[PDB]
């Protein structure tokens, strides 16, 4: 379907296979299926025909918010309140949709596993990677800010988390 | 005593002449609305003390009470300005003199300052 994107949401091609009957004995699941399609799916559509004409009669738009970029907390200084507050909305919206993020790449694992069915510990290995490293790279972000986070607490956290590999990586190289 | 024996202060001058360039209280400011709302309340309290009708008796009475306060919460927010305007600017004269005393720091950016983190876990 067009309401969503394919590339974002991806689903394997669908490949069912044919009916081949061995016995003479009618299929009841073929005459109910009939008998739900003549009773429920008819009526349904009509319904929704019927409603999406109504709808086109009255068509209008909305939109989606775009914001532009600004200075952040790293070039903001010290106890400037104005760019602070700035940088401190710009970081909260980028961690929504950092978790929004996240949230897009469970429900492709959680899709791909119920797909897969039995055969989910070797299908699904390639979303189990893309997800280990989302998560991985989100924990490292926001893993311990706690309840009061800010922009300044996540850039602290980097400036030590550089910190200490460039420790490592000194160290290494002597 | 801290503005007690600033100089040229004039002994006993509620206002001085130096307060003339202040902007006056607004009539609606909401400080004389209080002080009205205190009249009021001081006319209610007479009314029920001397068990008069507490709303109804007194009408003149009430609005002398309201007129009175308006009135001295009028001057005493015009003092109350000057000395604040006064405390401001003496103290900005003292900081333009004292530039040793009050040195700009220089700003460095939150790239520059380093911050220890303490994880809540
Ligand atoms: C009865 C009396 C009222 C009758 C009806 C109105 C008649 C006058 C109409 C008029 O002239 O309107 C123009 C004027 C428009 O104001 P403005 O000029 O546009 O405002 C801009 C100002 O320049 C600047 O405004 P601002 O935003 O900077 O605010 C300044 C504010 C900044 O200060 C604050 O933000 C802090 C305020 C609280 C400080 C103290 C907290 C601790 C004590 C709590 C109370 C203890 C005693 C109980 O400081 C003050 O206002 C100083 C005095 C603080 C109290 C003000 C109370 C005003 C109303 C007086 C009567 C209240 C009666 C209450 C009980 C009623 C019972 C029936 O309107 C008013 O002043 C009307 C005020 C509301 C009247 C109705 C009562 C509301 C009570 C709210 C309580 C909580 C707040
Ligand atoms: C209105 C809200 C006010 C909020 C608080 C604001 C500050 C206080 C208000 C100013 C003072 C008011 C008068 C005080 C004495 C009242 C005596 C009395 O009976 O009064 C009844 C009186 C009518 O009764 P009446 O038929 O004339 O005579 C009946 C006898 O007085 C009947 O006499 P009785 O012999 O039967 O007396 C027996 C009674 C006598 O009891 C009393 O007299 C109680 C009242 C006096 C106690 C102290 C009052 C507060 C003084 C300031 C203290 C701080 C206040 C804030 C505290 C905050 C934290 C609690 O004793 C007891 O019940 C003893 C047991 C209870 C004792 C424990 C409770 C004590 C509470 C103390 C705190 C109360 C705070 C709120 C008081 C509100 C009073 C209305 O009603 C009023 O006074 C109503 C209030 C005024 C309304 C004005 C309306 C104007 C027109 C509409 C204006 C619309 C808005 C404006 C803008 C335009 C829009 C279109
Ligand atoms: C030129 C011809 C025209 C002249 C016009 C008259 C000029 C002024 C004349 C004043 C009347 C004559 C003197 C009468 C006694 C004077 C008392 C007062 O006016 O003097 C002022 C004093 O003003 C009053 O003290 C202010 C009264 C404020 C009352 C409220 C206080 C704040 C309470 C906080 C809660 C308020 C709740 C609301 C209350 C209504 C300044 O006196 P000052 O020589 O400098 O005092 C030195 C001592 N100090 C420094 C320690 C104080
Ligand atoms: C009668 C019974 C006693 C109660 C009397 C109540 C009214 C007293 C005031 C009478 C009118 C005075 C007057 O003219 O005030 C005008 C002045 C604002 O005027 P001005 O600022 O020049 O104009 C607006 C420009 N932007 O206004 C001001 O500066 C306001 C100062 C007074 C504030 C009073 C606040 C309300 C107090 C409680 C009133 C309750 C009335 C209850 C009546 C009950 C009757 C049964």
Redesign the interface.
């Given at each position: 379907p067009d309401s969503w994107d394919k590339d974002v949401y991806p689903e394997p091609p669908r490949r069912t296979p044919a009916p081949a009957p061995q016995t003479s004995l009618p299929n009841p699941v073929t005459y109910l299926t009939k008998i739900f399609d003549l009773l429920v799916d008819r009526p349904v559509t009509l319904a929704r025909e019927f409603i999406e004409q109504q709808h086109a009669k009255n068509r209008y738009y909305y939109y989606h918010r775009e914001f532009r970029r600004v200075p952040d907390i790293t070039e903001c200084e010290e106890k400037d309140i104005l760019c602070m507050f700035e940088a401190e909305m710009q970081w909260r919206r980028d961690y929504k949709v950092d978790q929004e993020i996240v949230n897009i790449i469970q429900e492709r694992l959680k899709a791909c596993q119920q797909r897969e069915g039995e055969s989910y510990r070797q299908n699904c290995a390639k979303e189990l990677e893309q997800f280990t490293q989302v998560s991985k790279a989100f924990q490292d972000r926001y893993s311990d800010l706690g309840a009061h986070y800010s922009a300044r607490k996540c850039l602290a956290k980097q400036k030590q988390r550089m910190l200490a590999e460039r420790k490592a990586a000194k160290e290494a190289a002597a | 005593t801290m503005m007690s024996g600033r100089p040229g202060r004039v002994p006993l001058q509620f206002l001085p002449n130096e307060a003339r360039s202040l902007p006056p209280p607004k009539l609606t400011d909401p400080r004389l609305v209080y002080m009205g709302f205190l009249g009021y309340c001081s006319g209610l309290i007479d009314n029920a003390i001397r068990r008069r009708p507490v709303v109804s008796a007194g009408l003149h009475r009430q609005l002398l009470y309201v007129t009175s306060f308006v009135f001295f919460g009028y001057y005493l927010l015009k003092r109350q300005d000057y000395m604040y305007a006064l405390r401001d600017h003496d103290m900005f004269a003292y900081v333009k003199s004292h530039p040793e005393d009050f040195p700009e720091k220089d700003?460095?950016?939150?790239?520059e300052?380093?911050?220890?983190?303490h994880?809540?876990?």
């Open positions: - | 700003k460095k950016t939150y790239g300052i380093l911050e220890e983190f994880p809540v876990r």
